[PDB]
Amino acid sequence: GGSDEDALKAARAIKFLYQSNPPPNPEGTRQARRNRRRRWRERQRQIHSASERIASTYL
- Please name the method used to determine this structure: NMR
Q: Is 10 helix (H, G, I), strand (E, B) or coil?
A: helix
DSSP for 21-58, written as a single string: -PPP-TTSS-----------------------------
> What CA–CA distance (Å, rounded) separates 58 from 42?
47
Residues 6+ apart with CB under 8 A from 3: none
Residues 6+ apart with CB under 8 A from 32: 24
> What CA–CA distance (Å, rounded) separates 6 from 12?
10
Residues 6+ apart with CB under 8 A from 24: 30, 32
Distances 15 to 7, 10, 12, 18, 26 between C-alpha atoms, Å: 15, 12, 9, 10, 30
